[PDB]
Design a binder for these strands. Structure first.
Ligand SMILES: [Mg+2]
Ligand SMILES: [Mg+2]
Ligand SMILES: [Mg+2]
Ligand SMILES: [Mg+2]
Ligand SMILES: [Mg+2]
Ligand SMILES: [Mg+2]
Ligand SMILES: [Mg+2]
Ligand SMILES: [Mg+2]
Ligand SMILES: [Mg+2]
Ligand SMILES: [Mg+2]
Ligand SMILES: [Mg+2]
Ligand SMILES: [Mg+2]
Ligand SMILES: [Mg+2]
Ligand SMILES: [Mg+2]
Ligand SMILES: [Mg+2]
Ligand SMILES: [Mg+2]
Ligand SMILES: [Mg+2]
Ligand SMILES: [Mg+2]
Ligand SMILES: [Mg+2]
Ligand SMILES: [Mg+2]
Ligand SMILES: [Mg+2]
Ligand SMILES: [Mg+2]
Ligand SMILES: [Mg+2]
Ligand SMILES: [Mg+2]
Ligand SMILES: [Mg+2]
Ligand SMILES: [Mg+2]
Ligand SMILES: [Mg+2]
Ligand SMILES: [Mg+2]
Ligand SMILES: [Mg+2]
Ligand SMILES: [Mg+2]
Ligand SMILES: [Mg+2]
Ligand SMILES: [Mg+2]
Ligand SMILES: [Mg+2]
Ligand SMILES: [Mg+2]
Ligand SMILES: [Mg+2]
Ligand SMILES: [Mg+2]
Lengths: 188, 155, 167, 131, 260
RNA sequence: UAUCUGGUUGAUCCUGCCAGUAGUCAUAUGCUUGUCUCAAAGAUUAAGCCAUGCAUGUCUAAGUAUAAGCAAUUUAUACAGUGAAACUGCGAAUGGCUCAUUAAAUCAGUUAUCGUUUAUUUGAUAGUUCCUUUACUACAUGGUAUAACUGUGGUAAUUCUAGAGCUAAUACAUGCUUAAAAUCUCGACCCUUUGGAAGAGAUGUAUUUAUUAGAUAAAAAAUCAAUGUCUUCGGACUCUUUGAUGAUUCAUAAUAACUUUUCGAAUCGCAUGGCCUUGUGCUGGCGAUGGUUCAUUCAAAUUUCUGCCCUAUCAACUUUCGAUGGUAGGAUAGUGGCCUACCAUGGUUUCAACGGGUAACGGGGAAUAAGGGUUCGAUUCCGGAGAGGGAGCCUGAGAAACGGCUACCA
RNA sequence: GGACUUUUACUUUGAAAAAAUUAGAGUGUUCAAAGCAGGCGUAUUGCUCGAAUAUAUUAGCAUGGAAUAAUAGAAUAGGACG
RNA sequence: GCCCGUCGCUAGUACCGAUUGAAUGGCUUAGUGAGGCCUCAGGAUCUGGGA
């Protein structure tokens, strides 16, 4: 199958190298998960030494954390919009690490307005206490508050779907969000 | 090498898991991480003062120096962020009881913390494979410029 | 002599790559697969033998078939299978409902029954108890050793505080 | 795949094949100690050769160098043991001398004759082989 | 080459065993265990090649399978079980106890010890880490894991292990001037207090050693095994006390004891 | 163990080779051959081809016995002795053989994993598993479907097997359980203080992500946001807890969640004793097999520095369709152009690259004896490679396996 | 623990280091090539010496030396100390 | 005396040479492409969406 040996390949001098031994399984490679969006489908691959690796091909929910907020929700993945490696991953909406995706917002909105009682965009007792205890601390961020109105949030996939079977990520924020925002329109 | 831009890739260049919370208003924009490589190699100040990214940087990146220590003399700085040094060495032949000049070129990574030019003597430190040919990463400049500014105009 | 194989369709013969847990192949070795000729599932004049299975009975009896009956070789061996093959409820105690097969030794007739299994017995219950016991007995032992270390740490701190108030 | 059995050959043949001075000299020994081979002399000359080589080497090392002292003393007492090296001359510059004949006059075939018991080396041989 | 190797051609077998070149072909390959292959003394070797208690290898299984032999306390029944340095071998029948410590020639000696000393053993701690759940553990040269050791126990210190129960009852720090047993290299088997440690960041610390003859040598820190205070070991030493006599000195000792 | 001799001339001194001489773990052949010990051996040519036979199987008190098997005595009406067959488990990845390929490859010495996998051995290691949490969940233990077998069959033909009827488990597939505590979130209420609260849920391990702790380079202060413990209610916070390496985002832990949810014993053998409210209650001895995580051991995989025979009638070479580097990903056990995208124009060379040759596997070593050298190493040990040639892959901890499968070629 | 250090060659001592081979010690395989044995008694209930040493060179590591031979230094002073 | 070359005889070796000659081995373009693996489907049968 796919060999990962170096022993094909020209020597740094530019020299051609002879074949010494056949392919060994311990230098083997496998094919890309090329995971897509929707309706959970995951196959296990038996890797070296016993040991499973989970090949997610097709996924519709991932676990996504709002770093600055210290929480993480599970959401639908609306999905893909920018990829640094290869633009066909975007057009095909393919899921890989570093993929910029859009997720769902609604689980983060429900949390925030429950936690801050402030509502984005545009009477219990101790709850009142906690809300008033917070704020001067609820001051979100322009380019994130605006995303909630569209019910869709930008997020950078940070797991490895073809290895772990999870499509997890974080919400974009600050300079990093600024960055992909700029590309996102300086190409749209 | 680097120079300018720093945010000049398709992917946003960042140091892993070094979060800056936008809620907390800061006076330095970006929190920066570094270490000392050990073996009493001073992490130079351009590494800390800097804003370059290089995850193969011995001081600001995710490599470690372990193994060998080599000091070559730099013979090519054409590759962005990597150099080739000539290891200066000398080799005995018993039958004739004399020696014969030999050399070996070595490719080494070079952090934007360093600013190397051809001619410099350079101490390099071994690390994990970093590329097809590079198993070494600069770490310290024993040189400077090799009498460059001492060659200006007339009186 | 090549066998038919459910599923192939085709009224011819083809060579297939077979595995474990499939008809017309008994693997000699773990992970062994063999390529083997197989006859299709669709009937044709090339067949030496068709394998039929009477599903229900005609208007008349077929001699050596409906008129002769042959009993199951073996009886229920596992505890609850004995229960269901007599409908019993976990109250009746299997021990005597287990089937018994007679056999003559010339002038001696022997009676041998199976050996019930997954039968709940004193010896088993004892081993359940015992493991339940160890898990807890260890757990408590493991707690002690922590606390006693926390002590060794606590009165070590109490050496570096009567020291850091000596000089 | 089993440990090799080690062997060695135990003699050496003279370079010049036909030197009559050496050939006379060899035969006289043959008939003086009841030998049957030029090899029985070729053998001893080989035994000597190394004993001498050994001794030569030690001599080049410093007086009372550790190895010299250890292996030199050892070589001597081995030689004294069988009666090739006389007691007086016992410090290796004489083993450096020595001689083929000294080794010869210690064979059992000769000692059996040297004190009576045989009278002629050849009777002495025949006696030995015949148990 | 495809997988774990299971044979050992005698000749490739480690020399300190003292097996004869001929008579066979293979030597017993030490089981996986508490001691490295190359620095171990398989039970087969000990019971037949040293103690002469067995003539056959087939007779060694006969002896073992009656649980006559038991290592560091436990019964143990593995012809080629890897016995190693500091271990304690016991024969209940024949009322005999043994420790595996080294010669001066770097060989494992038949060394008889008292029932009392068969209580415990000595372990060089080889690493000290923080285990799961914050429980600190030490790990000694024979690969015992011991939970909750003394904080002042660091790496290279030696440790008195109970045996009957697994626990620790003492530890000797690695200080300048402490009785040391050398476990590898040429200086294997020598003993000598310690003079000084050459640091050497990132590549092999040297340990300068002097014995009770005012003789000096040097080994890698890896090869150094503390065992107490000058004068005071924590186990009985073999005769020789690990002093290493010159080939001359040995010659004279053997030829001074000459008259039957 | 530092030696020479014969032959150019009429004679002579040289240059110089041919011939002589000696050894060969160096092969063949010829002649001759009594004894002891030792004991290489289809390498060279043809990694050419192979008739037949054999070379990998395996059971403990301790996974599975209703052989319509044997044996009877000996307590055994569930089983209990012994045991074919078969299931299950483990092994067949070691060994043995050969030297075709291989010239910076392998190999040797020396390194590296802060760059990973690891059956097994050895040592450690698990009180948490259910559920809107009074009319309750098999734990005194839940499910079938199969071999062997019986019986009906097919083919000239093989370690081919089909239809029908049974029955096991440490095979397959499920699925309950246990102390106390502390901390978090919610919050019915009451009352305005400076503010507190019943009780409700959640907190095993593993998986994935994000976040925070993991201090220490000698000493001190103010303020902002949240919020701790102690009040002699203006206020103080006193003692404050810290692991390893040369070096880390290390070991370890904490927060919010995530998972077609990993493990958390429905197993087996010897013993049968204690305890009283007399339930066949509750307890309970030795050690087998297993089990997650860590350590160890046997490994493996890559890897640093330096070292190869002849050759210029081989001088430039490397990117066709990766050549050299940067970014991101994918893939892998894991680093890495290993592979793919984007981008750049690099990398090696008279200190001989690149190419060719090798009747080239490397090494420990062998032969030859002044010394310096010269020649050899298919071959008893180490490493590598292969199994007619190529490639592919199943099983598995481990094979790109050939006394395994699959295809093509011979 | 902090703060900084012109580069090398050569040489020394040492560490790390497979066995078998080789050099070589001990020991009368009857001798010897070998082997690594063996030797003493109460030879009726055991006593005991061994199974060394050397070599192991290039490269890498570690320590001493400062002759020999190279490198670097301050001259548009952008020199040196505080 | 020595002695050079063409010419002639026998035998041997190598060279040049129409045959766009032949042979073996190693790489390799382009075209065709088995097979296992991965993957989109399929769904004989056989269960509780799954195999
Ligand atoms: Mg694919
Ligand atoms: Mg460039
Ligand atoms: Mg059962
Ligand atoms: Mg073994
Ligand atoms: Mg190290
Ligand atoms: Mg003549
Ligand atoms: Mg003449
Ligand atoms: Mg004349
Ligand atoms: Mg000649
Ligand atoms: Mg052969
Ligand atoms: Mg052949
Ligand atoms: Mg029976
Ligand atoms: Mg093999
Ligand atoms: Mg079923
Ligand atoms: Mg199971
Ligand atoms: Mg702090
Ligand atoms: Mg610390
Ligand atoms: Mg971590
Ligand atoms: Mg009872
Ligand atoms: Mg040519
Ligand atoms: Mg030229
Ligand atoms: Mg790259
Ligand atoms: Mg393209
Ligand atoms: Mg170019
Ligand atoms: Mg040349
Ligand atoms: Mg070859
Ligand atoms: Mg060889
Ligand atoms: Mg060779
Ligand atoms: Mg050959
Ligand atoms: Mg192979
Ligand atoms: Mg063949
Ligand atoms: Mg091919
Ligand atoms: Mg194969
Ligand atoms: Mg084989
Ligand atoms: Mg040396
Ligand atoms: Mg030796």
């Amino acid at each position: 199958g796919i060999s990962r040996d170096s022993r094909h390949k020209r020597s740094a001098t530019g020299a051609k190298r002879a074949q010494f031994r056949k392919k060994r399984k311990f230098e083997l490679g496998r094919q890309p998960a090329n995971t897509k969006i929707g309706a959970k489908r995951i196959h296990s691959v038996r890797t070296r030494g016993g040991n499973k690796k989970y090949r997610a091909l097709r996924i519709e929910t991932g676990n996504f954390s709002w770093a600055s907020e210290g929480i993480s929700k599970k959401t639908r993945i609306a999905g893909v919009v920018y990829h640094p490696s290869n633009n066909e991953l975007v057009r095909t909406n393919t899921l890989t690490k570093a993929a910029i995706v859009q997720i769902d917002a609604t689980p983060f909105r429900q949390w925030f307005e429950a936690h801050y009682g402030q509502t984005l965009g545009k009477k219990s007792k101790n709850a009142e206490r906690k809300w008033a205890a917070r704020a001067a601390s609820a001051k979100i961020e322009s380019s994130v508050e605006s995303q909630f109105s569209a019910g869709r949030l930008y997020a950078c996939i940070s797991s490895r779907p073809g290895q772990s079977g999870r499509c997890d990520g974080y919400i974009l924020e600050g300079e990093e969000l600024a960055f992909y925002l700029r590309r996102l329109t300086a190409k749209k | 090498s680097t120079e300018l831009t720093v945010q000049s890739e398709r992917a946003f260049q960042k140091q892993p898991h070094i979060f800056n919370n936008p809620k907390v208003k800061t006076s330095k924009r970006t929190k920066r991480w570094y270490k000392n490589a050990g073996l009493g190699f001073k992490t130079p100040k351009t590494a800390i003062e800097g804003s370059y990214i290089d995850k193969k940087c011995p001081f600001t990146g995710l490599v470690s120096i372990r193994g060998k220590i080599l000091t070559g003399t730099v013979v090519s700085t054409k590759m962005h962020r990597t150099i080739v040094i000539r290891r200066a060495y000398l080799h005995y032949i018993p039958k004739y009881n004399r020696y014969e000049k030999r050399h070996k070129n070595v490719p080494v990574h070079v952090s934007p913390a360093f600013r190397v030019q051809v001619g410099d003597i350079v101490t390099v430190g071994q690390c994990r494979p970093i590329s097809k040919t590079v198993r070494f990463n600069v770490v310290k400049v024993s040189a400077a410029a090799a009498k460059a500014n001492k060659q200006f105009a007339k009186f | 002599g090549f066998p038919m194989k459910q599923g192939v369709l085709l009224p011819t013969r083809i060579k297939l790559l077979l595995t474990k847990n499939v008809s017309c192949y008994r693997p000699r070795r773990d992970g062994e697969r063999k390529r083997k000729s197989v006859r299709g599932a669709i009937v044709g004049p090339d067949l030496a033998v068709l394998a039929l299975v009477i599903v229900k009975k005609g208007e008349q009896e077929l001699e050596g078939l409906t008129d002769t009956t042959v009993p199951k070789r073996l009886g229920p061996k596992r505890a609850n299978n004995i229960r269901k093959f007599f409908g019993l409820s976990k109250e009746d105690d299997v021990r005597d409902f287990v089937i018994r097969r007679e056999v003559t030794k010339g002038e001696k007739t022997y009676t041998k029954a199976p050996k019930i299994q997954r039968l709940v017995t004193p010896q088993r219950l004892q081993r359940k108890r015992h493991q339940r016991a160890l898990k807890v007995r260890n757990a408590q032992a493991q707690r002690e050793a922590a606390a006693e270390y926390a002590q060794l740490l606590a009165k070590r701190l109490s050496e570096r505080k009567a020291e850091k108030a000596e000089i | 795949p089993r440990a090799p059995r080690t062997y060695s050959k135990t003699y050496s043949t003279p370079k010049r094949p036909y030197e009559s001075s050496r050939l006379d000299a060899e035969l006289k020994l043959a008939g003086e100690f009841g030998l049957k081979n030029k090899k029985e002399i070729y053998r001893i000359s080989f035994q000597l050769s190394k004993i001498r080589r050994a001794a030569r080497d030690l001599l080049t090392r410093d007086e009372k160098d550790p190895k010299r002292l250890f292996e030199g003393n050892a070589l001597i007492r081995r030689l004294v043991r069988v009666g090739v090296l006389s007691e007086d001359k016992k410090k290796l510059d004489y083993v450096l001398a020595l001689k083929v004949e000294d080794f010869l006059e210690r064979r059992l075939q000769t000692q059996v004759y040297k004190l009576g018991l045989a009278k002629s080396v050849h009777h002495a041989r025949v006696l030995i082989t015949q148990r | 080459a495809r997988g774990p190797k299971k044979h050992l051609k005698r000749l490739a077998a480690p020399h300190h065993w003292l097996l004869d070149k001929l008579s066979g072909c293979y030597a017993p390959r030490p089981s996986a265990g508490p001691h490295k292959l190359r620095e171990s003394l398989p039970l087969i070797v000990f019971l037949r090649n040293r103690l002469k208690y067995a003539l056959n290898g087939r007779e060694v299984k006969a002896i073992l399978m009656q649980r006559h032999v038991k290592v560091d306390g436990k019964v143990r029944t593995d012809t080629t079980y890897p016995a190693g340095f500091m271990d304690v071998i016991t024969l209940d029948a024949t009322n005999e106890n043994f420790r595996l410590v080294y010669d001066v020639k770097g060989r494992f000696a038949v060394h008889r010890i008292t029932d009392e000393e068969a209580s415990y053993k000595l372990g060089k701690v080889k690493k000290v880490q923080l285990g799961k759940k914050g429980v600190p553990y030490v790990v000694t040269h024979d690969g015992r894991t011991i939970r909750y050791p003394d904080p002042n126990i660091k790496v290279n210190d030696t440790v008195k292990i109970d045996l009957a129960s697994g626990k620790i009852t003492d530890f000797i720090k690695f200080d300048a001037g402490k009785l040391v047993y050398v476990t590898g290299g040429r200086n294997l088997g020598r003993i000598g207090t310690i003079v000084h440690k050459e640091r050497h960041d990132g590549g092999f610390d040297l340990v300068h050693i002097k014995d009770s003859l005012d003789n000096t040598f040097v080994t890698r820190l890896n090869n150094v095994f503390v065992i107490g205070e000058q004068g005071k070991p924590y186990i009985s030493l073999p005769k020789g006390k690990g002093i290493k006599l010159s080939i001359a000195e040995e010659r004279d000792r053997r030829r001074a004891q000459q008259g039957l």
